[model samples]
Target: LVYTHAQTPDVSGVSMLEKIQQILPQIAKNAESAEQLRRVPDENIKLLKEIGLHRAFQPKVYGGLEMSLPDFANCIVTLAGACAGTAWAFSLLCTHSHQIAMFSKQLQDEIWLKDPDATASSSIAPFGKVEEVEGGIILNGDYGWSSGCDHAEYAIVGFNRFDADGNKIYSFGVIPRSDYEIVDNWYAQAIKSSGSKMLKLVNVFIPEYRISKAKDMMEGKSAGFGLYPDSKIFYTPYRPYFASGFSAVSLGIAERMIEAFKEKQRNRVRAYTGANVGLATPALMRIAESTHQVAAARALLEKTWEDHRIHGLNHQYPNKETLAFWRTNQAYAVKMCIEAVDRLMAAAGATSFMDNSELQRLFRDAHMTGAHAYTDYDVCAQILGRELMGMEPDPTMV
Candidate 1:
């Protein structure tokens, strides 16, 4: 969330981020409209596109910025402050580009050749129905929570892989926009504008080139494994790229909540006593502690980002120790940020509970951040704990 202007080889990324800053007020103004529409406004998407935000994690060879993870995280953090739902939706859309790069060159070309602006949505729950075919498979299912599906050109769906004996395995398959139906079903108490709809694919034929094995992608055996071997940014697993923004979004919401709480406190008064309690001991203490907590959370995420960048720059795939930290650090950071937001909200009193209050929205969205499977603190703890204890990681735990 903290960004300082400096000379860098990727000045364009910083400049793009600054341009996004210029539109924060506009984005903030449309937050309510987005909530009502249950999706980011077209105007907001257009503005964001003008800044090339969707290309942040894409391969530079394919007309993307290929910005460092840290730089891209900073942009998402900033966007979340204005509208968390919009940030959440767009983050997924943009990061899916990185995932797409892991597909076969044919798939990548099919996706980005004629239209470099193409983005994707994903529903990777291993719930899809798959029928093996000669050259590919027939995928059918109603995969849910395909975030930003309304704005994407494709959907990356997951189906249980099966051996010759029909035993379940794991893998993901990509389908074009024409192959699936976007079922609008994104109503929720928080992150209401994310447009996380259900994607209904019926008898969709998936070419082998469009499918990526889960184990292969995780272990660097996917089709596009070394397509960008010399590229520092592409020499990593896709999960980190796919799920990186949730924690940043959490941090941004908490950071904005601090400002909202303080602004309310500055004008608030004790209802019963008619005293100016805005600057009282309780309020000041709450703000001070929450501010520190958010700062600490930011520090943790920055460390994680740096670790990812260092690993890529050195072309060193993460070992178990490093991967464990990379995986769990953001979840812990999100946990801390959520705690901070809750602490501040508890002290904000009944006024903040109003539907119109930004603090209330932040409270709601903050909880949603932790709701994600990747950012769930308990699962993260188990993942890290198993790694620390030298125990085999239970895939089901995640």
Candidate 2:
């Protein structure tokens, strides 16, 4: 039989983490261009793709690595430190493959089977309009915040699914890129390079086979559940994979902030006194405190990432309490990293506030991680608090 698949990458003897590190200098070099272009530079995407980082969370059978959660998270942390926009945009593409793996076998075949390198970007807020059709629904509405829209061949659009009796449930569907038009509108203060433009779909029909509920996915009853028995990461639910990038990206920026702070302080002098501010006690204390805080943040997030893998490998899906802790655990980390960035930003002085520096860019992107609905500490606190108090999640809290 003729083989239609692309050849597997031959990154022999080189560790994935090292491969990412090798490209960091160039990625950092292009960070400014990414923001200027209002998207990740194609060169950054190309360099990453050449190493198959985009296939990190994809299914092994589809030429993907099915990487352990912690391993993938490590790469994101390393990547984000160099270019948060590239990390923000590309990590979603990787994570979406993990989400698609939990979808039906049919959908998986349609995606990865056709193009082993296929990655999807999702706009998963249940904000689209749905009209019941023969076998599925006709979907319409302008979906917003589609990050990395320019690079993917497929999009997973979310909407409310209803039964014949008219009971509504939150769900999402797979649509080809041809079905939607991307509205270029991603200008923002932070993550300006994320390219989270709005996706416009008009009267696009989706088949039932391509749709599933967020509820079913969480409960391990989705169409593709247990389909990949050996793929440990796919053994978990979708939300963790779907929302992992927010914290990972933030942590990267925070880590890089430490480096940024150190170098900027190395040879600095006060404007008036002409004395070395870098040698000042306050400057020394600021760096030390932020370093400690960022290290703590990494400890928390790495534990959470590893826990997801352990649960999946053991074939034990996350219990409600486990899920609760996982939800708030990353939020807590984001809080830590943002605080670290904030501290470093203040001490970096007035020069760091300028638009033309890496310090300001990292500061801008670091906070974007906390701005996400998933990383919202207030809601995360409520969710974890309820669970700790032995109460079920309040519908209002989510």
Candidate 3:
């Protein structure tokens, strides 16, 4: 069966990017209220659902758009420019489908067949207390940082357990939303509207078919490997899809910062004297340099995403070196984006620091991108450093 289908601008001739753009102004208008609400409004989620944006990574058989990674990231970057918190949470809801496609057929049906437009959120830290059972395993944990949990119909949580030979194995379990309870503890300085709350599992049972090993997916040995022979996206590992959003969101914030700065400059004047500081030589230089940095970050991210597409389309799974580069490259992009945002925020003036300015919110969200383990440059540096020396990744680093 042909699991993959070629993409069109849209089934109705409207591009996905254009559809996303159509809703951005409304989403942008809600940025501050989203922050205060401490979760994306149901209105934002419903609008995205209407556009099928959350289904971008889902299988077409399940009535999804099945868009490519780079294409979807473009949409995400644009969406983020409008509202980083919505983008942060909503992106995960989309990316998790790419991972779900790597599971068994029964598991896949369990997710999509029940609700063709269903989406999942994840907190994949492998911190579950697992107890072996006759048919599967019993899992219980308070999984935190599950962004967009409020909107998910399902969740993919993680577990760590030892095999018969005492080898510790890391695996993921697909659970229905009904199995877990959402605890609203998402208070944070950045991405406050992401609704990245905690999910408490009380000895929930996960069948064997719903569990997939982490290493199996990375090494092309997952149960669903050959299930989608014609699928372009399912041929490669899951990391490239799972963790790439951190940088994309960072890029969006930086991109939006440029627009926000330009508008502020158009009318900004020095308070003490009647001088228009926005037209000053120093202000011009600052915007010029930051613009250069943000553009480079965008180009870098697009190239990396395109490489992932080519690998999957050609059925060429990446080796250690390619994987290392893929993982670290985006972190580097994130580094540039944070640097660009910081440069702009510094020259953004004291009024820009007021609680109401978009600049301050973008600055907060930009820094939060680097705070993630995936975008942590220091850890990314070590991972790439070991690979350059032709050494195995340190087991403790992740």
Off by over 4 Å in 2: 1-12, 163-166
Tell me the tens digit of each residue's lDDT in model 3 across 1-398.
11111123545778888888899899999898999999999999998889988888776777777687888887888888988989999999999998898889888897888888788999999888999997899998999999999999999998897979988899999999999999999889999999999999999999899999998887788887877777778888887899878888998899899889889998888788988677888888888888888778877777788899999899899988989999899999899989988988998889888998999999999999999988889999999999999988888876
Pairs that collide, model 2:
none
Predicted candidate 2 versus true structure: per-residue lDDT over 1-398, tens digit per residue: 11111112246797778889899899989988888999888899899999989998788878888887777887888899888988998999889888888789899999877888888888988888888889999999999998898998999998987767887798989999999999998889988888889999999999999998988887788998888888777777788888888888888889889888899999989899998778688888888899889888888787788799898898778888999988889999999999999998988888888877789999989988999889999999999999999997798856
Task: Tell me the whole-model lDDT of each prediction, alpha carbons only.
Answer: 0.87, 0.86, 0.87
Candidate 2 TM-score, true structure as reference: 0.95
Clashing pairs in 3: none
In candidate 3, where is summed lDDT lowest over 10 consecutive residues? Answer: 1-10
Off by over 4 Å in 1: 1-14, 164-167
